[model samples]
Target: TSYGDEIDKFWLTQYVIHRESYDFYSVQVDYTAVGLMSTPNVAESYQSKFKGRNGLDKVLGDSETTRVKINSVILDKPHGVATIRFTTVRRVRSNPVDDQPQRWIAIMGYEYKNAEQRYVNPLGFRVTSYRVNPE
Candidate 1:
């Protein structure tokens, strides 16, 4: 298989929805030049911001579900399956109308290959992860 072809096997990969809060806007990385990011700090930072407010999970959370939405999550460089843990805080509040359910969401992570290439580099990874809870 190619570099990031293994990721394609995951059906959820295709269902990705980028959030304005995340940096990349829910785009997939190509499989060629995914090896540019060499530093662990850089990778971590990328993972943090990518899965931050603008991350996909956050964006999809609010738009897709009523309670428990992902705001963002930070990732710790890739090891095996690309570990993207939650970090962002979830916000829950009652809607204006009593009939409406409470709003609860917090993005955690967006794991994927680099955008330029589909390659899942050793240090070249991206994720948008966060925490979530019902309120």
Candidate 2:
């Protein structure tokens, strides 16, 4: 792949893992990184995701860990869209030895922006719109 394609693919793969994979202790930190890499609206939506009554804590009373893996990243640079297929394994404290796996596809709309480079990201790329569904 070319430089642009390589970067976008790498970044999106990082985004998938950072935003989707979490443990009892890493959710806050990883999600913060996810917010920084995403657009304001997307960031806001995710930041509050774990704060409500039916949040992670309430939903998974026991410790639940998630591991995400990227299966494919198909980027439409001209149209500014990316469709990523991935898999996630959730291991609950109730049965740490067992792994629950699921397949998901995330369709993201993104764009390049003009901004000063941050420590985490240098390309000034942001995900403007994003949604995921089971595949």
Candidate 3:
């Protein structure tokens, strides 16, 4: 059997880090990175969340920035799925009063992409599903 599964997991871990770690100013850049590795449906879910009143960008504004600390990534390569556990600490201008750290779990569903994605994303890694829930 091939050991390629480990490589996929490594790339996925990087994807998860990019997805979770971003400052208010870097939100767009980070989202683009995530979208590049994801299908349209999955990308849209992330894009749609940063608009409107309670949207992440609006809530973050200028001073708020988010940092991610990854604890673990449990991958089931045979099933094409994984779950990542992490914590996000939102610091408002690095003040003494930091937002409470939040625990989150990302459940990912993935697949090997065809040539369409391979052309741009050399790894041929494509994220078919992405859902993050608070723990």
Candidate 4:
């Protein structure tokens, strides 16, 4: 697949799955896989943010469900970077007061590495930066 395609698959599907499920452990592991973490301490920072206030569970809730929509993707293949704009709609279980869709913009950096000297593996393409923008 092309670099952009790989980024789309990794970012939109796999990453979003871990996030939507509140699987912080898997998220941590995957972030490492995608080259998001520079060190163990970086992973810990992510853990705290993911589990802290306004985090996954707090924002989406335990019983809540969510759907992610990709609004745009700008990829710079030569530079191995991208910017994605997306929206997330949380289907609240029973709290009408906490129901609203959120918009986010993510900046990603990726790399391709040789795997076993036989195949090319796409690495990183992680959301190195982000912002919560008004929808």
Could you give candidate 1's per-residue lDDT for residues 48-114 as a string of tens digits?
5336687645554433322222333332224322222222223334444323433333333334342
Q: In model 2, how large is the Cα lDDT of residue 77?
A: 86
lDDT score for candidate 4 against the true structure: 0.51
Question: RMSD to native for every prediction?
Answer: 13.7, 3.3, 3.5, 6.0
Best by TM-score: 2
**Residues 9-104 of candidate 2: C-alpha lDDT, one tens digit per residue:** 988888888888877676666766676679999988877767778887467755777899899999998888899999998887787485868999
- Estimated TM-score per prediction? 0.20, 0.83, 0.77, 0.53
lDDT of 4 by residue, 1-135 (tens): 245565554554444434433333344454344333223443365566545587664664456566667777777766655676777776656867645768877665544323532221245334443333554
Q: Rank the candidates by TM-score, best first.
A: 2, 3, 4, 1
- Ten contiguous residues minimizing lDDT sum, candidate 4: 112-121
Best model number under lDDT: 2
Error of 2 at 2 (Å): 11
Q: Each prediction's Cα lDDT score? A: 0.32, 0.79, 0.77, 0.51
lDDT of 2 at 36: 62
**Residue range 1-135, candidate 3, lDDT tens digits:** 123766766767778877887577677667667877788898887788777897877876776677888888887888788898889887777688768899999899877654444434566567898889998
